[PDB]
């Protein structure tokens, strides 16, 4: 047969942002990523931390090497930069929506590079932030990225929503709508 | 931003077959999105994927210690991490919440399950439905949870049945009006 499982340790460094990422993937899901600032292992599901540990210090050892390699590759490609690939934004809910029953609006930003994006949730045109969360830049097999944004909400026939996505591969900020 | 971007990407991949009977390890480097060098455990040495990776391929290959570590990776990295995660990743099993509701189109929403392997079937009067059934496919919610939606074009008890690893028996939700 074929592969049943695949664990991927993905990491990236981006110039001129001077930002990097270090994560672990398991069949599409993020096990954990390392918060470079706090030098802390952030598990996707807190429960994971009750069973495993990771030396976050290790992550930065990789990123340093990647920064060094980037410089080498940048000089070696004759400073050929990245071609912006615009995101495919889709908005769905966590479970079927019913008025007054708690749900989550998921904004799925897919197939893009570089890994820099600006996502903002709008409710009736105004930005919303209460309880919002986002994943980290998740890798794709075609070496582009994925990202998930969450907005816990209470379904009503009153409000409409918008996932506003900004990416240099786009001309004007992308807006993906959602209404009951 | 006017400034052009330069991205460096590195992926250490572990592919498991039959538990951990077979394991395959890759160490891939990507210029922007283009892989230039890779270590394949089945090759045992760094291979330049594109001519850009040649210096690295030759240089890294001349390192007995680096090659030793990568050659050991299938056991020390892959099989080890598989063991550490095994219980909360490979073994993770979350049961689906099924909901049948009218959109005559009938929608069967199967939500919050892990792993993705699932079977959703529509039955009308105890007989399965093939034609008129539409699926949304597996949807990863990005939180170790999946969702799937199966619509049935309806002309009578309609039962949405779900088979998932986390269950000993199928989940049936029977609907009438």
């Amino acid at each position: 047969i074929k592969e049943e499982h695949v664990i991927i340790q993905a990491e990236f460094y981006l110039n001129p942002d001077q930002s990097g990422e270090f994560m672990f993937d398991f069949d599409g899901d993020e096990i954990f990523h390392v918060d470079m600032a706090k030098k802390e292992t952030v598990w996707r599901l807190e429960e994971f931390g009750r069973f495993a540990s990771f030396e976050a210090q290790g992550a930065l050892a990789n990123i340093a090497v990647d920064k060094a390699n980037l410089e080498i590759m940048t000089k070696r490609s004759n400073y050929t930069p990245i071609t912006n690939v615009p995101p495919e934004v889709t908005v769905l809910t966590n479970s079927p929506v019913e008025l007054r029953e708690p749900n989550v609006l998921i904004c799925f930003i897919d197939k893009f590079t570089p890994p820099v994006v600006n996502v903002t949730w709008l409710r009736n045109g105004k930005p919303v932030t209460t309880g919002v969360s986002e994943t980290v830049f998740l890798p794709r097999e075609d070496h582009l990225f994925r990202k998930f944004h969450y907005l816990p909400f209470l379904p009503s026939t009153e409000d409409v929503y918008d996932c506003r996505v900004e990416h240099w591969g786009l001309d004007e900020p992308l807006l993906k709508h959602w209404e009951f | 931003d006017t400034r052009p971007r330069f991205l460096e990407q590195v992926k250490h991949e572990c592919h498991f077959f039959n538990g951990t009977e077979r394991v395959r390890f890759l160490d891939r480097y990507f210029y922007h999105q283009e892989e230039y060098v890779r270590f394949d455990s089945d090759v045992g040495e760094y291979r330049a994927v594109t001519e850009l990776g040649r210096p690295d391929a030759e240089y890294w290959n001349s390192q007995k210690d680096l090659l030793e570590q990568k050659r050991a990776a299938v056991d020390t990295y892959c099989r080890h991490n598989y063991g550490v995660g095994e219980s909360f990743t490979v073994q993770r099993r979350v049961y689906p919440e099924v909901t049948v509701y009218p959109a005559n189109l009938l929608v069967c929403s199967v939500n919050g399950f892990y792993p993705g392997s699932i079977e959703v079937r529509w039955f009308r009067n105890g007989q399965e439905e093939k034609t008129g059934v539409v699926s949304t496919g597996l949807i990863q919610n990005g939180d170790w949870t999946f969702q799937t939606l199966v619509m049935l074009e309806t002309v009578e008890v309609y039962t949405c049945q779900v088979e998932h690893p986390s269950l000993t028996s199928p989940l049936t939700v029977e609907w009438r009006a």
Binding site: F51, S53, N62 | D27, P55, T76
Partner: peptide, 12 residues
């Protein structure tokens, strides 16, 4: 139990 990181090869 601990997850291990594979080192990134340094270039030339």
């Amino acid at each position: 139990a601990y997850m291990r990181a594979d080192a990134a090869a340094g270039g030339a």
